[PDB]
Amino acid sequence: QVQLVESGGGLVQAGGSLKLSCAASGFTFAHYAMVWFRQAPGKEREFVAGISWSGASTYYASSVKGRFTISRDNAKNTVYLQMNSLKPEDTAVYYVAAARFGVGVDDDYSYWGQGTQVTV
Amino acid sequence: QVQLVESGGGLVQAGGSLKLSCAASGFTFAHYAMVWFRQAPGKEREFVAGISWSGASTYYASSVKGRFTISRDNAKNTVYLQMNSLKPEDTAVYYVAAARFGVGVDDDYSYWGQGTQVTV
Amino acid sequence: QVQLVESGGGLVQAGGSLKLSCAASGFTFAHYAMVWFRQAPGKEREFVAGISWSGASTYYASSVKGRFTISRDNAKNTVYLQMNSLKPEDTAVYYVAAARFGVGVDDDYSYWGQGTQVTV
Amino acid sequence: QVQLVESGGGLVQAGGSLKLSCAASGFTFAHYAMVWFRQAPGKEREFVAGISWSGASTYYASSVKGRFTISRDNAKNTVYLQMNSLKPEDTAVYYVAAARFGVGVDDDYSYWGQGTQVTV
Amino acid sequence: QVQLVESGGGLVQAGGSLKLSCAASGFTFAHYAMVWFRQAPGKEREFVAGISWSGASTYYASSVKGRFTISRDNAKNTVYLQMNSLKPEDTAVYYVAAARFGVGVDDDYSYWGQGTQVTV
Amino acid sequence: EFQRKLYKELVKNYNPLERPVANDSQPLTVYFSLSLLQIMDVDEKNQVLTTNIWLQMSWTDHYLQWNVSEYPGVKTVRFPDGQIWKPDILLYNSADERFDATFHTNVLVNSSGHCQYLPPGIFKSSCYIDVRWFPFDVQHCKLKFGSWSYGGWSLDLQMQEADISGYIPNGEWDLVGIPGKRSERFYECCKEPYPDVTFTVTMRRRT
Amino acid sequence: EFQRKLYKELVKNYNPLERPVANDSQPLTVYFSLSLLQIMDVDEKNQVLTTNIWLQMSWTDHYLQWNVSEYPGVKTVRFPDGQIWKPDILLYNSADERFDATFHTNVLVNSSGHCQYLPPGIFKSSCYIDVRWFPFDVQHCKLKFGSWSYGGWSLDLQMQEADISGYIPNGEWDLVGIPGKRSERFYECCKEPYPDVTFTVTMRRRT
Amino acid sequence: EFQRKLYKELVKNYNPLERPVANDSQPLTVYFSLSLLQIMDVDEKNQVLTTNIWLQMSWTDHYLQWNVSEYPGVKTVRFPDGQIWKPDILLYNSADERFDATFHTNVLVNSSGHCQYLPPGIFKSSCYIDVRWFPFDVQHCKLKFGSWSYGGWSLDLQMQEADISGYIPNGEWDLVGIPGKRSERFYECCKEPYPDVTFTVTMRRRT
Amino acid sequence: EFQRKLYKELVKNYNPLERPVANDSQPLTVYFSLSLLQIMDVDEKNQVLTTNIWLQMSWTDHYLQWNVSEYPGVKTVRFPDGQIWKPDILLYNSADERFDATFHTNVLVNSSGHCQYLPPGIFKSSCYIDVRWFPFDVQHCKLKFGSWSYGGWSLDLQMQEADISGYIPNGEWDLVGIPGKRSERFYECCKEPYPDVTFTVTMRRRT
Amino acid sequence: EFQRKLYKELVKNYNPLERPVANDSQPLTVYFSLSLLQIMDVDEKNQVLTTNIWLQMSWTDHYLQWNVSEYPGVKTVRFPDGQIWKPDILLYNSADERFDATFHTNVLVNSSGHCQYLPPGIFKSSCYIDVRWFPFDVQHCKLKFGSWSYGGWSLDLQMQEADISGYIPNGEWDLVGIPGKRSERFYECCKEPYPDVTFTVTMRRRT
Ligand SMILES: *[C@@H]1O[C@H](CO)[C@@H](O[C@@H]2O[C@H](CO)[C@@H](O)[C@H](O)[C@H]2NC(C)=O)[C@H](O)[C@H]1NC(C)=O
Ligand SMILES: *[C@@H]1O[C@H](CO)[C@@H](O[C@@H]2O[C@H](CO)[C@@H](O)[C@H](O)[C@H]2NC(C)=O)[C@H](O)[C@H]1NC(C)=O
Ligand SMILES: *[C@@H]1O[C@H](CO)[C@@H](O[C@@H]2O[C@H](CO)[C@@H](O)[C@H](O)[C@H]2NC(C)=O)[C@H](O)[C@H]1NC(C)=O
Ligand SMILES: *[C@@H]1O[C@H](CO)[C@@H](O[C@@H]2O[C@H](CO)[C@@H](O)[C@H](O)[C@H]2NC(C)=O)[C@H](O)[C@H]1NC(C)=O
Ligand SMILES: *[C@@H]1O[C@H](CO)[C@@H](O[C@@H]2O[C@H](CO)[C@@H](O)[C@H](O)[C@H]2NC(C)=O)[C@H](O)[C@H]1NC(C)=O
Ligand SMILES: *[C@@H]1O[C@H](CO)[C@@H](O)[C@H](O)[C@H]1NC(C)=O
Ligand SMILES: *[C@@H]1O[C@H](CO)[C@@H](O)[C@H](O)[C@H]1NC(C)=O
Ligand SMILES: *[C@@H]1O[C@H](CO)[C@@H](O)[C@H](O)[C@H]1NC(C)=O
Ligand SMILES: *[C@@H]1O[C@H](CO)[C@@H](O)[C@H](O)[C@H]1NC(C)=O
Ligand SMILES: *[C@@H]1O[C@H](CO)[C@@H](O)[C@H](O)[C@H]1NC(C)=O
Ligand SMILES: *[C@@H]1O[C@H](CO)[C@@H](O)[C@H](O)[C@H]1NC(C)=O
Ligand SMILES: *[C@@H]1O[C@H](CO)[C@@H](O)[C@H](O)[C@H]1NC(C)=O
Ligand SMILES: *[C@@H]1O[C@H](CO)[C@@H](O)[C@H](O)[C@H]1NC(C)=O
Ligand SMILES: *[C@@H]1O[C@H](CO)[C@@H](O)[C@H](O)[C@H]1NC(C)=O
Ligand SMILES: *[C@@H]1O[C@H](CO)[C@@H](O)[C@H](O)[C@H]1NC(C)=O
Structure with a gap:
């Protein structure tokens, strides 16, 4: 019963803060690198953040580095995206992908979440 | 004469229930894993539900688990999708794909159905 | 000078009949499986009908079986699509593809026609 | 400095004539098969004409054969598309592709031109 | 912390000049060929300029050669695009891609930048 | 055609590793039986027996079933080595430098998915040579076959009697016989059986 | 060019397994005939015959037809091993350690789809050696060829007379001849014929 | 099914080179131990020892772990050569023309990712033959195994005692024993250890 | 760089089969010439000649041309076996068990597309041995080379004189010479020539 | 992890042919040096020398550089044969039937891109045997190594002294020495040098 449930989305003003949280179930969370993708309404998916399976490597998109912070908690099987100073182009459905022992940037993902809409 | 005929679609209100049924012909139904895909009007196809060829494994999308229930009847060569508490984003053409001895999630499908439109 | 010329399209009312005919030239017609694809205006191409290179196997889409009938005449190098009881969703440009010794359903096509618009 | 410069486009009435010419530079023109593709505004690219690297084989699309004539001049490194009796659907940006020793129909192209807009 | 930061975009009139500059970090700049891609709003990405990893080979699109000039500075880890006599179709988000020891035209890129919008 | 359709469809979702x-x-029940063709060499200094043997392994691929009515004229199918799963039945006491003298032929599958595999080979097997009744010695050379990595409860190896209908008599050794025996061996860690089939060729020195 | 077009088109929808x-x-009718080049060795202890043989298999690929007018200058085509279907004709009574001494050359196909296959090989075959007329013995060594997995009604194996035009005489054995015979063998389960071609080389000991 | 799912998932992001x-x-700790089956040849002119040996290498693949509950019935998995990482443990003093007499079998991995590799082989090793106590000579033939390209701190090679439970006695040499010893050798450039395992077979000439 | 660009571009549309x-x-004109290095063995019982030969085949690939100015520093290119078309020139009267003793090296192509191929090999060829002037016999061993599947009008095989500059004298046979001759042979069905090059090594027995 | 990232990135744009x-x-400077392990055979009838040799080729891959800081814990990388460019250094005067006795091991590359290649082999080389001081003869057997297709200005072959630290003494021949010499040979068409390294093993017959 592999499931990736995202939460914490909604409406924010510019220069705000939001803590997106995704809970994983049905698979070994510590064995998978967990990354955040975004889908803007009429564009294509793009990488936002990614953390390695060991949690020792975090990779952020150039458009978001310094503002977004990806983290993981293996005890609660959770992936956190702490976003600070959001901006109008940070408006999309954010959803989480999981890759088996992935590095965190270029990986073949196995499980995909539903996603939460955030609007700026 | 491989054919996958879907039926049971139509108009429903939110928090309703619908039993979609797909009948298969022209191929050994018990040898194929049967999955449900949906096509929203201006988006891409996405997995909704899937049952293994043996019927011992059911996989649901994170957006729909708990509400939708996939089942199969090999005697009547039928795949059932029992949907409870539908929601406005559950509005699409639902069509059934068949994969030879597939697991039920990631498979190379061989036969595709026409599809029934459901609107919430 | 491989050419696939389709003809017989136009405007029809619902529950009508149309005989689309495609003439082939420049290649051995008896060595190729000949299939009909359709392109609705703002959607993707999809299979409608297909006949094997030997003409002993006809495959129809589930949305059209019983109403459409594909046939071939090797003497005149012609592929016929006899459509009965057309329906509003049978409105598209219909064009013919040729696959070398193809089965008639899943094949790598070599030659493509121009297409005739039919509207219901 | 591989460059493919197209010229000769513009506005024409139906049943007219236009001579599109593409000049090539930066590569051995006699070693490449030179083909014409078109891009209509809201559709996909499609093959219009093609000449082999030796110039002994010309392939035209079924929609355009008899009306368009592809030719090549290796002395001036030029590809000519002589269009007669243009039609409203012959409205697109026409651009030239080059394939190394290509046959002229199905080839892996290496160099692409900019393109000239023609409107009917 | 691989990052490609583009800067120098904005609003320009026709027949103007703009010097786009992209700074690279987190990877060996001298080991990567650095190219400029553009994304017009409702079209696909396309190559504009490219410089080899050694800086001894510059490749420009046929639509832009003579007007745009790509250069690189390995001491400052910077890629420069000097654009002269811009034109209305030179309106897009310009972003930089990096390919490991790439030639500069056809390469598998590893790192992508964010991009700067220029309008003519 | 129907054979083309069947060959395309049979490998839709197929992993040879599974x-x-x-x-x-x-x-999975795998029936094993060998066919002795001739005893080529009995090496006494290096305790090695060289024989011509045609192995026969029969199993059931649940994934290679099809409808004869849906595929007229195609009641059988051939798959080369490496495209479908095959049992890893090897000669344990083999003294060949390559350790696998089998020639990997095509596996034949019929409509019910029954797979037949007939590898010919020139098998060099380790056989203790007892020379103390030298002019009238009878020797029992064991050919021990088993799955290299599968045990019981995964690959149930069953035995069928070897046939000597194609045997070519040797000028030095007389084939008294070749009876087969299926044995099960157990680890200490688990109760998992490990089956094997030993064909004990009995030969008499010709005087 | 036309050869490039033909090579690209011929493999559009082609399965070598079919x-x-x-x-x-x-x-499918497959015509088989061997060409004897020389008899290299007649092993008497190990009952093995070593010969140089060029096989010749001719069949018709229905999928490799093309128009010479549409492809000027290209009236023939070559396909390596593994890219097109080839008959699995093997020497049944072969005593070679690899069991297949054929060198897989290219298959030659002409405009009508006729495929020619000429595998050279140094064949080691099992031959019972009778030594009781030792100084004047005539020996009949059988070379039995057949499809490993195809039977009748699928692969109709037909025989053509072997040619000894390139034969190199041996210093110990005189080639009395090499007549071929086509035989059909039947299972009990089905009425399906299984054809085979046996070339019986007749040799006389040279005194 | 669950085995199909596991086989598809285990190779999602897997590089055999890593x-x-x-x-x-x-x-990575790799446990190495050999099993002597028989001493086939002791060549004295060419100082070469020919033996039948089954290697046993055990390590832990961190990438081949799975949940037995999530994959019921699948507690083990097999991977052929070239699809997963294997230690490059070779016989350094090998006199074989191919230098690698091992037959690459499948690697067996269980739910915790523990990989077992059992290559059989007929090993030809360089052994100095001392013939000066000729009728009563005892010879120490060293079988030196080690990683070809990995050193210490990357591939920690550990030793397990060799077993002679399947040993077949030789008619000319008596196996006094086969003790193993793990040694570490150092470069001048770095303090990086390089481990190796030497099994010194001790044989006595049989009189 | 320019070599990378050239290697990527040269295989854009390339079929090795064409x-x-x-x-x-x-x-296509293919120039053939061999280089004799040493005569290793002259087998008299089995009429086989074993020699060390370096073949040299030169042709012109029309598809492997490039501009040196457009690719500075890259005036030559190497292609392994199987990536570009090579002539199927084989030794017809070869008695080797593999029938092809050539070691497939890389083909060297320069800016004009000229391809050079230099396969070394230890060739075993069928040679009738005449022993009736035994102490003073001169033997003519023919090495017959030709395209296996191409004939005339497709592969024009031309001859170049063999060089013996690297010849190593033999202790039993004296190399009188090795002249080459190009011959054309015709079928009855067509007027299509079939060229071949025969190098007739002339040796004298050393007394 | 970092090793996975490095292995994925190193082959982003990599052509082994370049x-x-x-x-x-x-x-490109390639440093070549051999290590003699033992002289196995000195064949006098067939003028062939059989030796155990470990080649050592060191070069610099400009494309296999990485940052140790960016890839912590990964200071080295291994690439199998066929995935990265390797020098085509072969033994010119080799009498082996395969002509290449090297066992293709993995190439080891460190952070600066320095590639090390250590192919072991049992080399059969052509050596003129002079037997006229038979009981006290000293023989100079040349092992000539060079790039098969690269010349000077492309592959600069440099020599390093061979080491005999692992040499195993032979019972018939005493290793007087093995000095190496780098030579350059020139075509008439171009001034392009062609380097080669000849190691001349000097042996004395043991009395
Ligand atoms: C396909 O092959 C199988 C196996 O040969 C046939 O099924 C039976 O299999 C058992 C053993 O598994 C044999 O003992 C029987 O003799 C087989 N029945 C026969 C030969 O009639 C099966 O009949 C074959 N054909 C089809 C269409 O499945
Ligand atoms: C192509 O090859 C075939 C076979 O060699 C030729 O067709 C005939 O085939 C039969 C046997 O199948 C032979 O007995 C005839 O002699 C062949 N006719 C000939 C050689 O004229 C065919 O002619 C060849 N050429 C073409 C263009 O198909
Ligand atoms: C899988 O295999 C491993 C290794 O055999 C088992 O784990 C233990 O491993 C150590 C050495 O790594 C052995 O000494 C122990 O005896 C092993 N424990 C056992 C055999 O119980 C592991 O138990 C096996 N099974 C699973 C489910 O991981
Ligand atoms: C490339 O190689 C060819 C062939 O060696 C050179 O062209 C001439 O080829 C003929 C035979 O085809 C030789 O007889 C000539 O000697 C060659 N001319 C020379 C060696 O100058 C060609 O010159 C080489 N170089 C280039 C740049 O094409
Ligand atoms: C990587 O390997 C190279 C080569 O061994 C080291 O660089 C020097 O290389 C020259 C020859 O190219 C040697 O003579 C030196 O001894 C090498 N320096 C050493 C060993 O310190 C290099 O140091 C190695 N390590 C790194 C990180 O590049
Ligand atoms: C890996 O090991 C190093 C040194 O032992 C340690 O510093 C580090 O924290 C470990 N974990 C990593 C790199 O994730
Ligand atoms: C498989 O076998 C097990 C045990 O024999 C049984 O419990 C199960 O119901 C079977 N079927 C499955 C897992 O689909
Ligand atoms: C194939 O042969 C069968 C039997 O001879 C015949 O009934 C059929 O019409 C033929 N053609 C097909 C199956 O297309
Ligand atoms: C090829 O050769 C033929 C005959 O020699 C000739 O007629 C033709 O013009 C040539 N060129 C082609 C086919 O492009
Ligand atoms: C390469 O070498 C040539 C000649 O040594 C030199 O002219 C050139 O500047 C160098 N660098 C390049 C081509 O990038
Ligand atoms: C498929 O097989 C079933 C039973 O095995 C049979 O009833 C059915 O008719 C077959 N399909 C066709 C198209 O005949
Ligand atoms: C193709 O072949 C047919 C008959 O075999 C012939 O009539 C036709 O002319 C050929 N095609 C061309 C383009 O000539
Ligand atoms: C996966 O394993 C953990 C512990 O190893 C266990 O608690 C969990 O129940 C397993 N998953 C399932 C679906 O049972
Ligand atoms: C390409 O070659 C032609 C003649 O071979 C030459 O004129 C031209 O200058 C070359 N290209 C370049 C870029 O120099
Ligand atoms: C990469 O290497 C350079 C010099 O080799 C060093 O200054 C830099 O710190 C390294 N990168 C990182 C992330 O440390």
């Missing part, structure tokens, strides 16, 4: 069983918790 | 027949319910 | 360690700064 | 000719109706 | 040089107009 045991072709409907249920993963029960073993 | 028998190249228009109708799957009738056999 | 050492299967969670942390790249610590070595 | 003869590299601009016009398909005219033959 | 010489790994930053500038295509200057040669």
